């Protein structure tokens, strides 16, 4: 449920697994082995199969296919604590594996990884899933400890062992690792080599028997940002590199345009997850706003690219049906950003008209409610203000005539034009 609770319970988990390492003399108790059986059976016959699948190493990453984890988080955490007191470290490490991705969203991966380190020190024989090893690279990158993250990723790719009943599983891990290595080079500003690593991660994802669309989406989005930061010389070298055979490169002649195309593919490979559609098309709209006002845009093509920017921001605004909840600050901001991006496109096409000013006023109003959201603490507020900025966003779509698109797939947040991909990615 709450960030601060999970931290407090994960910290004890660690401090007690630290004591078991010293105290040792595995003198459990009948109350310990009972309370383990106690807490594991409360787990809904559902999470229990998940723990078993994770126990026996069915995948290196938990499949997405969670509300399961979010609901049973309190139970999971109690069973984790009891599994540890019973010195059942395989079940504890399976539970850590299962809550890992959800707890990254809670900003408590640090405490979780301290539990994972404590289980491994208590008995080095315990598996520890690649996802959890990679997680410690992720928070090292987020911290600016870039060398440490590389060491982690290196030790994962070679050298107290986890193994894969599959060959593709090993290349999936290497692809995610290579992706994060690309993000490291990106943090440092080494745009070209970042893009080579991000490209390698994409080739890998595409080589899987079933291509990892999540990975392709997030690598295409990283590639888009790298294209935006690239020098024109960086982009020319990458474009004429005989080892890169990406349709983005051959089909376009400007790094902003390849960036906007990479964002369109990122959104499509994420067509069912509306938050990453919105994120991707906002970057797409920004690229096209930048390109269409640059001296590189043919004057006769200016209107065309601005209408592409228009369409992108609109898709973003359409990722949420009218009166439907929005929870996080990031998604709230992204929504205000798409509304002002749409308003800006109309401004660039038509100047300061009555409808541009009215829309601009609406964006300021939403901006105020968004800042009130980001400076609140009581949950009633965050829920009530979020409604208010979403109420204003709905006003903006109605005011600027945001036409819904129809797509054959009922649950795709991306138009049919976006979805031409996969075989068309590498030509």
């Amino acid at each position: 449920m709450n960030n601060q609770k999970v931290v407090a319970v994960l910290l004890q988990e660690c401090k007690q697994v630290l004591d078991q390492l010293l105290l040792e003399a595995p003198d459990v108790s009948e109350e310990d082995k009972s309370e383990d059986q106690r807490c594991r059976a409360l787990l809904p016959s559902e999470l229990r199969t998940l723990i078993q699948e994770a126990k026996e190493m069915k995948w290196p990453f938990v499949p997405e296919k969670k509300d399961v984890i979010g609901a049973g988080l309190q139970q999971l955490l109690a069973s984790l604590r009891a599994s540890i007191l019973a010195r059942d470290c395989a079940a504890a490490a399976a539970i850590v594996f299962l809550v890992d991705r959800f707890l990254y969203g809670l900003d408590v991966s640090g405490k979780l990884l301290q539990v994972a380190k404590g289980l491994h020190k208590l008995q080095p024989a315990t598996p520890i899933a690649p996802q959890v090893v990679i997680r410690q690279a992720r928070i090292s990158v987020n911290s600016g400890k870039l060398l440490k993250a590389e060491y982690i990723l290196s030790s994962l790719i070679s050298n107290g062992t986890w193994l894969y009943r599959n060959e593709s599983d090993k290349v999936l891990v290497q692809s995610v690792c290579i992706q994060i290595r690309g993000q490291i080079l990106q943090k440092l500003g080494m745009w070209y080599e970042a893009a080579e690593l991000i490209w390698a991660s994409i080739v890998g994802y595409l080589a899987l028997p079933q291509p990892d669309k999540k990975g392709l989406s997030t690598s295409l989005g990283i590639l888009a940002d790298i294209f935006v930061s690239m020098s024109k010389n960086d982009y020319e070298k990458f474009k004429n590199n005989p080892q890169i055979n990406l349709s983005l490169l051959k089909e376009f002649d400007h790094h902003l345009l390849s960036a906007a195309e990479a964002c369109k593919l990122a959104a499509a490979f994420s067509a069912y997850t509306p938050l990453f559609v919105l994120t991707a098309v906002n970057i797409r709209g920004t690229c096209l706003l930048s390109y269409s006002s640059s001296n590189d845009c043919p004057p006769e093509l200016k209107n065309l690219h601005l209408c592409e920017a228009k369409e992108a921001f609109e898709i973003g605004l359409l990722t949420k049906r009218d009166d439907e909840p929005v929870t996080g600050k990031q998604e709230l901001h992204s929504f205000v950003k798409a509304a002002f991006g749409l308003t800006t496109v109309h401004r660039r096409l038509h100047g300061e008209t009555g409808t541009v000013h009215a829309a601009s006023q609406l964006c300021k109003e939403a901006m105020g409610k968004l800042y009130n959201f980001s400076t609140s603490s009581r949950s009633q507020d965050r829920e009530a203000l979020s409604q208010e900025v979403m109420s204003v966003i709905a006003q903006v779509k109605e005011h600027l005539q945001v036409q819904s698109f129809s797509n054959v797939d009922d649950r795709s947040y991306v138009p049919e034009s976006f979805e031409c991909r996969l075989d068309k990615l590498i030509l």
């Binding site: 500003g189 640059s294 300061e352 964006c363 901006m367 800042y371």
Partner: protein
């Protein structure tokens, strides 16, 4: 200047706005906003239209983007701000009004020096990484927001992120090595020093750059600059010797 010449200076015509959105030479921007006067203070607890201005040391161009900025409360003079194009959307940012009577051109020159310092931080951090040194100098220049009413410039605020035994090397050794590196990497024309002295760090491998000052052989614009005197004083009083980082990055003594 007449009243009309001040009205023309504070009003971005569509042609002006088009140049700004494409990218504009530093000399052109300084000329275009020199005779603006003092802009009034902006209303707090309110959202405003703004032009985000970014300078690029590579292209030597200022590029404008339209954005929206909320100006919040005074910090218990600095105030909270939140704008749609801010780098860390979950972070908090702090704005200050620019109302010095010496003119807007001093503020833009200041931000160009900060981009020049930041350019050397980036290159230095790449060299640290290449040599397997687990530390980065952290530095982020302020951004300029031009508050607009319609096409009329109403205000100018400077925005900054709210940021308030590792061993091997001490923060001062990193800071002086950065200054030595900035002298080699600029081909013996610039030296960057911290006016605060690398006192601050954090719980990581981050050493903070707070107040960069660039002693330079070149002079351009009206920035106060110790020039060649500063460079000699650096290599003879502040970085008299050289440390292990200087040696790992293969820096040599000059004159």
């Amino acid at each position: 200047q007449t009243s009309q010449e001040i009205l023309e200076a504070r009003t971005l015509q569509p042609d002006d706005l088009e140049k700004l959105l494409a990218g504009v030479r530093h000399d052109w921007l300084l000329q275009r906003l020199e005779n603006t006067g003092v802009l009034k203070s902006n209303q707090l607890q309110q959202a405003h239209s703004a032009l985000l201005l970014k300078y690029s040391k590579k292209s030597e161009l200022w590029t404008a983007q339209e954005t929206v900025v909320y100006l919040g409360d005074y910090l218990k003079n600095a105030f909270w701000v939140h704008y749609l194009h801010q780098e860390e959307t979950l972070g908090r940012y702090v704005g200050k009004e620019y109302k010095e009577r010496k003119g807007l051109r001093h503020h833009f020159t200041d931000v160009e020096r900060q981009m020049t310092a930041q350019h050397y931080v980036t290159e230095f951090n790449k060299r640290l990484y290449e040599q397997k040194i687990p530390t980065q100098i952290f530095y982020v220049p302020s951004t300029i927001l031009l508050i607009l009413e319609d096409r009329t410039i109403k205000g100018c605020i400077s925005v900054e992120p709210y940021i308030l035994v590792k061993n091997e090397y001490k923060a001062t050794e990193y800071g002086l090595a950065y200054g030595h590196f900035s002298y080699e990497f600029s081909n013996h024309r610039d030296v960057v020093v911290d006016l605060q002295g690398w006192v601050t760090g954090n719980g990581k491998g981050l050493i903070y750059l707070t107040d960069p000052q660039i002693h330079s052989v070149d002079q351009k614009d009206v920035t106060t600059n110790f020039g060649k005197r500063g460079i000699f004083y650096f290599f003879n009083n502040q970085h008299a010797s050289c440390n292990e980082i200087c040696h790992r990055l293969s820096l040599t003594r000059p004159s």
